[PDB]
Amino acid sequence: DNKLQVEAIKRGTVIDHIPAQIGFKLLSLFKLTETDQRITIGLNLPSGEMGRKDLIKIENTFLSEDQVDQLALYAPQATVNRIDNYEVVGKSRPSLPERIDNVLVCPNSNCISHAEPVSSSFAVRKRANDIALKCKYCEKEFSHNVVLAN
């Protein structure tokens, strides 16, 4: 027959219930694949809670509450499982962070952040049912949908 098998991880993180099409986006942003650690990704998996979902497993790697919170912009209904000795030892859900640093680029062409050795930074807030991001430097505010990443 065959030797097909996916060996459960001893220690690390399992990001579950990622909405369809978002899994690859998370990998791209947070540079999750820039590591020598074993990673396992399932995309378009069947789900009871969601119908379709993506799933990211990363060995020997953990996310702080803030790192988990960054995920709220993209996958708010995701579950982040911390794993030690093959056991789910922690389950967290992303709560909207107060700031998003480093990964996004201010869309204002005249912002000082583009010309100088600083890291991007936006304050995060709910506006209607949109998420508004206010650049720490130029203080202009944008819909998160138009604020690109690096």
Binding site: P117, Y137, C138
Partner: protein
């Protein structure tokens, strides 16, 4: 220490109603009773990376009326940033080993905020950062509005012209919104409208504001007519249809205006205020400019002198 001692002064959005009132109270006192040696032995940097007449000269004048010395530049072309490719970060990193405060104007939004991240314990005072903020303009404006209306609350305030790129009206609207019951009329071309982050802030505070297409609609009601220049140096090429003042105030436009109403303008004006307005008792933009001395003296005192003055 007073609440503002050694504080960076970057954005009105970082200040409270109490901070603003503290500047104004200090201004009254120093105008009443000048303390010509309050800042003796201070050396302050005056660093202007874009053009200025009023802000730079009033700031430097304020520094000398208080006894401080002044170093700096009125353009960047002959700094090492201008000729040798130095970053602004490195410029601030060295200048902040020389002086007791840095006053800076810069053409990019966020410049003054960035400077604070490299100035260590040296306070940065934002003399204007692109189309973002102009907090010391707001201080002198508040002083002037108080001087002529007797209060900062329950006022009818029209702002006219380029509201999108007016760093002056961004700061001033945020500041007046910290006071109770002020009402706003925004008279701007569609393309240069007041930005959404300012309007959202007003809505959150339940402040009333509306858009008008003419000065005449609001003239009867207004206590403060705040005229602005089109910020042509900030305009995207797509916005070049808006270079000429869309609204021109003339003396005849002032018939049905309240006797308490003042016309303000952060200056320079192009044609948005005709010279015939100058002689009318409503004109107060030159008096407004002169109050920059008291506001800026006040701010330097609060930032560089530990105790409240008397």
């Amino acid at each position: 220490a007073n609440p503002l001692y050694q504080k960076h002064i970057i954005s009105i959005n970082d200040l409270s109603r109490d901070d603003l009132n503290l500047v104004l109270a200090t201004a009254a006192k120093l105008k009443a009773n000048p303390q010509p040696e309050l800042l003796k032995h201070k050396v302050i940097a005056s660093c202007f990376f874009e053009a200025s007449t009023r802000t730079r000269l009033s700031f430097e004048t304020s520094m000398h009326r208080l006894g401080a010395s002044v170093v700096g530049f009125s353009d960047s072309a002959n700094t090492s940033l201008g000729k040798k490719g130095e970053t602004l970060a490195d410029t601030i990193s060295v200048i902040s080993t020389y002086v007791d405060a840095i006053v800076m104007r810069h053409p990019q939004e966020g410049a003054a905020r960035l400077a604070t991240e490299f100035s260590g314990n040296v306070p940065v005072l934002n003399a204007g950062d692109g189309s973002n903020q102009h907090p010391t303009q707001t201080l002198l404006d508040l002083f002037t509005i108080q001087e002529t209306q007797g209060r900062l609350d329950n006022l009818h305030v029209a702002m006219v012209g380029d509201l999108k790129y007016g760093r002056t009206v961004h700061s001033l609207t945020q500041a007046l919104a910290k006071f109770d019951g002020n009402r706003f009329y925004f008279i701007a071309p569609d393309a240069l409208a007041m930005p959404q982050y300012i309007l959202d802030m007003l809505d959150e505070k339940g402040i009333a504001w509306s858009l008008h297409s003419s000065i005449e609609e609001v003239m009867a009601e207004v206590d403060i007519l705040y005229m602005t220049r089109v910020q042509k140096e900030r305009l995207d090429p797509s916005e070049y249809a808006n270079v000429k003042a869309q609204f021109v105030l003339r003396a005849s436009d002032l018939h049905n205006a309240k006797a308490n109403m003042k016309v303000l303008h952060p200056l320079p004006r192009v044609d948005e205020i005709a010279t015939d307005v100058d002689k009318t008792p409503h004109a107060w933009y030159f008096q407004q400019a002169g109050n920059g001395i008291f506001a800026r003296q006040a701010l330097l005192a609060l930032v560089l002198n530990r105790d409240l003055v008397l």
